[PDB]
Design a protein around this motif. Structure first.
Motif, PDB file in Angstrom:
ATOM      1  N   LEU A 130       0.834  -1.322   0.023  1.00 53.38           N
ATOM      2  CA  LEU A 130       0.035   0.068   0.278  1.00 53.38           C
ATOM      3  C   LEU A 130       0.985   1.123  -0.179  1.00 53.38           C
ATOM      4  CD1 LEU A 130      -3.077  -1.301   2.223  1.00 53.38           C
ATOM      5  CD2 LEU A 130      -3.075  -0.372  -0.037  1.00 53.38           C
ATOM      6  N   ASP A 131       1.781   1.377   0.553  1.00 54.35           N
ATOM      7  CA  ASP A 131       2.641   2.538   1.124  1.00 54.35           C
ATOM      8  C   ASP A 131       3.510   2.640  -0.473  1.00 54.35           C
ATOM      9  OD1 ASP A 131       2.031   3.225   3.359  1.00 54.35           O
ATOM     10  OD2 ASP A 131       3.528   1.931   4.421  1.00 54.35           O
ATOM     11  N   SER A 132       3.765   1.517  -1.036  1.00 55.42           N
ATOM     12  CA  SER A 132       4.377   1.856  -2.477  1.00 55.42           C
ATOM     13  C   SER A 132       3.594   2.085  -3.720  1.00 55.42           C
ATOM     14  CB  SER A 132       5.022   0.303  -2.760  1.00 55.42           C
ATOM     15  OG  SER A 132       5.977  -0.021  -1.720  1.00 55.42           O
ATOM     16  N   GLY A 133       2.391   2.077  -3.327  1.00 52.61           N
ATOM     17  CA  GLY A 133       1.308   2.527  -4.492  1.00 52.61           C
ATOM     18  C   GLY A 133       0.641   1.522  -5.183  1.00 52.61           C
ATOM     19  N   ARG A 162      -8.602   2.327   4.504  1.00 56.44           N
ATOM     20  CA  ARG A 162      -9.546   2.999   3.630  1.00 56.44           C
ATOM     21  C   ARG A 162      -8.998   4.366   3.266  1.00 56.44           C
ATOM     22  NH1 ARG A 162     -14.889   1.770   1.965  1.00 56.44           N
ATOM     23  NH2 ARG A 162     -15.305  -0.418   2.623  1.00 56.44           N
ATOM     24  N   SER A 163      -7.900   4.993   3.930  1.00 55.64           N
ATOM     25  CA  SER A 163      -7.192   6.423   3.856  1.00 55.64           C
ATOM     26  C   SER A 163      -6.066   6.156   2.636  1.00 55.64           C
ATOM     27  CB  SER A 163      -6.471   6.764   5.095  1.00 55.64           C
ATOM     28  OG  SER A 163      -5.217   5.980   5.247  1.00 55.64           O
ATOM     29  N   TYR A 164      -5.859   4.985   2.088  1.00 56.05           N
ATOM     30  CA  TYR A 164      -5.164   4.871   0.705  1.00 56.05           C
ATOM     31  C   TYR A 164      -6.042   4.529  -0.401  1.00 56.05           C
ATOM     32  CZ  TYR A 164      -1.260   3.023   3.915  1.00 56.05           C
ATOM     33  OH  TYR A 164      -0.215   3.050   4.791  1.00 56.05           O
ATOM     34  N   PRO A 165      -5.776   5.566  -1.381  1.00 57.35           N
ATOM     35  CA  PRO A 165      -6.542   5.434  -2.541  1.00 57.35           C
ATOM     36  C   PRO A 165      -6.384   4.271  -3.546  1.00 57.35           C
ATOM     37  CG  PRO A 165      -5.709   7.806  -2.278  1.00 57.35           C
ATOM     38  CD  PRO A 165      -4.786   6.667  -1.395  1.00 57.35           C
ATOM     39  N   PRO A 210      -6.339  -0.653  10.415  1.00 57.35           N
ATOM     40  CA  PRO A 210      -7.533   0.100  10.435  1.00 57.35           C
ATOM     41  C   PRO A 210      -7.609   1.315   9.663  1.00 57.35           C
ATOM     42  CG  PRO A 210      -6.654  -0.475  12.874  1.00 57.35           C
ATOM     43  CD  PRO A 210      -5.687  -0.892  11.766  1.00 57.35           C
ATOM     44  N   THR A 211      -6.399   1.869   9.146  1.00 65.99           N
ATOM     45  CA  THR A 211      -6.265   2.970   8.431  1.00 65.99           C
ATOM     46  C   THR A 211      -6.234   2.920   6.749  1.00 65.99           C
ATOM     47  OG1 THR A 211      -3.737   2.765   8.378  1.00 65.99           O
ATOM     48  CG2 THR A 211      -4.751   4.196   9.971  1.00 65.99           C
TER      49      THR A 211
END
Ligand SMILES: [Ca+2]
Ligand SMILES: [Ca+2]
Ligand SMILES: [Zn+2]
Ligand SMILES: [Zn+2]
Lengths: 403, 404
Positions: free
Chosen positions: B59-62, B125-128, B122-123
């Motif tokens: 996720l952090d890598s896109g 959904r904050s990732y597009p 828990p976070t």
């Protein structure tokens, strides 16, 4: 123009008693909103509920709106281990309002489990446009609101970490709320980030006297109840309502979306002949009469999917007015007349997204001090602005400040 | 570009996913991961103690995260589902037998996946790039729900008794197994929840499953690129082997499929472990493949873009498809897109073309379509575009209720 709009909302079904409630609404020519707990469909909610599935079907076929009240009314937080007897076990102790919310991630998950169970017992449920289980919710015990970015507030003494509100030495401090309350606030926020609106209530149609063996018999009569509704019209009832655990202390009094509207809370189970008294016999007539006289008095009835009015072409909107469009809240940028092709959206120049959420989102008007989530991090809005795709918080260290 | 490649990885998040993600990052590409959250619970019978770390890194890598169901349908592989069920099913190898049974329960596994992902992260959904509630792929099954006119099923993907490589195995697409029928129903349930599902064109897998250390025989980069070239504009889902990977009625020539190749592979093929020396032998195959595919003129994209996003200022021809806010639309007339004229449920310029079956607003219904509405089924008798006043229960000149 009508005197006002009443929203009848019924909590804690579907149960057997729900069936005759729905028929009285139908005979009265009104629609209502039911916030359901699907554990009744599993037969573990400690009510008469063998017709629970029949009731769900009737509500939907009749055109009533179905919203999400969580799978088990948070009874998992009232007992040591959740199971088929937990409902009965929690009724034994009367500890519903103690430690009602604990792990907000688990508690919010109960709303998604509610969707699974509803769609298990009624596999066709999503073919009903009036199924709004994934759009509209209400938290157990809690007069809490997530309506728009600028219309939200919590029930700051809704649940307790020890004593019940009527017990001796009970202390409620809105400025320093209980752990259960804080948890419930986080639940509201989790649901809002999943696209839910949540709504509380202005008046609660309940027993006038809980200390008799048939408390349901004491449900306010239609005429005096209509007086309660008149009194709530435009008077910020959520701040003045009793008891103390039904309050919304920081409800935004006078907010335009709340004007000329009264949300009534009641429970299906108050209309059953059973352990709470002669609810069907005494109270179904009260409901029928209340609807008749409210209409005579100039009120109209509506449902919670329209509480935020749906966008409609041909209507002239003013700057700052809110609408709902395809389940999302929008706020008008300028006064204009809605045309077919000019619907609100993430790219509209005529509207901004104003969902009551906290995850960073495109085309939202952010204020100074707002805190948004983006890719697992939190950001303070330092420069108020309308968000756009190239101004994500991770790339914009002037508009946003990482927390 | 001569084409677009969509690298898709199934069955993560597991320890093996970490190194795959890093090769993708160093190669300058984004990929799509179809995840099974049971690895986060530690019951998926893989090296998975770093599962949450991998989900975070993806996720952090896109990279895009999509929904592969909570337990890869293993609940249908065992008598009673529990912490040992992945191990039990691996012991028998009965993954592909009776894989889909009660389609309501099986579809619910995709929703349970959302619950578990949102529990451990828990976070999320904050990732597009979290698309767990929008993009799915069915275990075992090369099945597709992309648009109203781009859908097809894996007609021999799973079996009621015999594995495809076992003596006696028969597959008949015209009379599919009970497991397959159930899987077709799962696809439709997910589509009515707003999902798109996508299969694949080519599967990057062991050339030889019968040798020791079978992961080692993963196709080398150069011949694999040969496979991709061959798939490009050639309707591979109908010709691919083995039989259980086929999409027999794939709509060859469908416009959204042109100039695109979807590659399926599995994170677990890229670790050194029980299937062989997958990290040592296969991470360099992935790295080299990316480099030579870019050299040959391919670009890489993710499955949220497989249906291209609506773009302001772009001219569109009547009949072209876009994705806007998670919903598929087809242009009604040629025109130039502008800010306030976006696709929607009320647009005169676009109609909704989601691959769903529930009656929906602003859909261009065709004669013979069958829709669901308020618990009943209706045949469309004449083509029209749906609108709020034209509900099936009130429009008997447009719809005819079918018998239960
Ligand atoms: Ca919403
Ligand atoms: Ca969608
Ligand atoms: Zn309740
Ligand atoms: Zn898989």
């Amino acid at each position: 123009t009508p005197k006002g709009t009443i929203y009848l909302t019924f909590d804690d079904g579907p149960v057997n008693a729900s069936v005759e409630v729905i028929k009285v609404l139908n005979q009265g020519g009104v629609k209502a909103t039911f916030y359901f707990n699907a554990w009744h469909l599993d037969g573990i909610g400690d009510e008469n509920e063998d017709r629970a599935l029949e009731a769900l079907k009737l509500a939907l076929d009749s055109g009533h709106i179905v919203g999400n009240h969580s799978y088990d009314h948070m009874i998992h937080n009232c007992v040591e281990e959740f199971g088929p007897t937990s409902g009965a076990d929690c009724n034994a102790t009367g500890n519903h309002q103690i430690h009602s919310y604990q792990d907000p991630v688990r508690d919010a998950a109960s709303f998604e489990q509610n969707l699974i169970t509803l769609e298990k017992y009624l596999p066709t449920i999503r073919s009903y446009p009036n199924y709004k289980g994934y759009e509209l919710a209400r938290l157990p015990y809690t007069n809490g609101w997530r309506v728009t970015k600028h219309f939200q507030a919590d029930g700051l003494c809704a649940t307790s970490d020890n004593l019940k509100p009527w017990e001796p030495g009970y202390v409620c401090d809105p400025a320093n709320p209980s752990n259960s309350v804080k948890a419930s606030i986080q639940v509201q926020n989790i649901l809002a980030n999943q696209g839910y609106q949540t709504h509380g209530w202005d008046v609660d149609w309940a027993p006038e006297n809980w200390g008799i063996p048939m408390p349901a018999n004491s449900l306010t009569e239609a005429v005096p109840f209509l007086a309660y509704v008149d009194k709530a019209l435009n008077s910020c009832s959520p701040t003045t309502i009793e008891p103390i655990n039904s309050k919304t202390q920081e409800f935004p009094c006078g907010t335009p979306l709340h004007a000329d509207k009264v949300i009534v809370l009641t429970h299906d189970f108050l209309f059953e002949d059973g352990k709470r008294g002669m609810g069907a016999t005494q109270n179904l007539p009260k409901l029928a009469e209340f609807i008749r006289i409210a209409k005579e008095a100039g009120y109209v009835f509506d449902t919670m999917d329209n509480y935020t009015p749906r966008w409609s072409v041909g209507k002239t909107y003013q700057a700052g007015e809110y609408v709902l469009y395809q389940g999302v809240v929008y706020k008008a940028v300028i006064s204009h007349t809605a045309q077919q092709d000019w619907a609100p959206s993430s790219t509209s120049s005529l509207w901004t997204n104003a969902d009551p959420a906290t995850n960073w989102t495109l085309n939202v008007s952010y204020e100074q001090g707002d805190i948004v989530n983006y890719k697992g991090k939190r950001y303070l809005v330092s420069v108020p602005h309308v968000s756009q795709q190239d101004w994500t918080p991770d790339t914009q260290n002037t508009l946003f400040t990482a927390l």
